[PDB]
Amino acid sequence: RTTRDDLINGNSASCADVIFIYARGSTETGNLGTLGPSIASNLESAFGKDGVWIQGVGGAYRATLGDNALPRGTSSAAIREMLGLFQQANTKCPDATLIAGGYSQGAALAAASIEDLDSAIRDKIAGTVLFGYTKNLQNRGRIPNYPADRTKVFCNTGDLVCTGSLIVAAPHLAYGPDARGPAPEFLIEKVRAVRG
């Protein structure tokens, strides 16, 4: 389903090995939107319902259309929200491995949050996937202060937001196949590499 709060609801005494924090695109429902549920399903098949906690970015993150025009591609309150989720994961489950992701505005938010994150906690994020990354051109396809090998960007030919514009064209809505196959595969591979 479109809403998952495994981290906020989860018990500190029975932590999952992996914790996935995801930010949805503008206007999307719940806290996972259209792509999050597909990635989560795959993560659960690889790690099991008890081995992974799926957590969407809700709270102050409204996923407003107008926030796309802000300097960082999203709002400060949204960034603080996702920062808090990473810090809460670190405190509640210190031995857990983190993975993250975002689509459209959520990709910009994931990038901004990961950039501001304390390096000690950022080191814990094994991999991040971004779809229709609105700051792809501007950021040269990277997440500042974060290793390139831990980042995977999915940007379709013709998806104008990857090329420096804020116009939604058909290719921007064609990320379903990626969220169901290659994106979770990347995440699963990164987690298995770090744990060892």
Ligand SMILES: *[P@@](=O)(CCCC)OC[C@@H](COC(=O)NCCCC)OC(=O)NCCCC
């Ligand atoms: P990103 O956050 C960037 C928007 C730049 C302004 O956008 C994600 C897309 C998600 O697209 C959909 O979910 N579309 C559903 C089809 C509706 C017929 O955001 C939008 O294009 N949002 C617009 C809201 C619907 C028109």
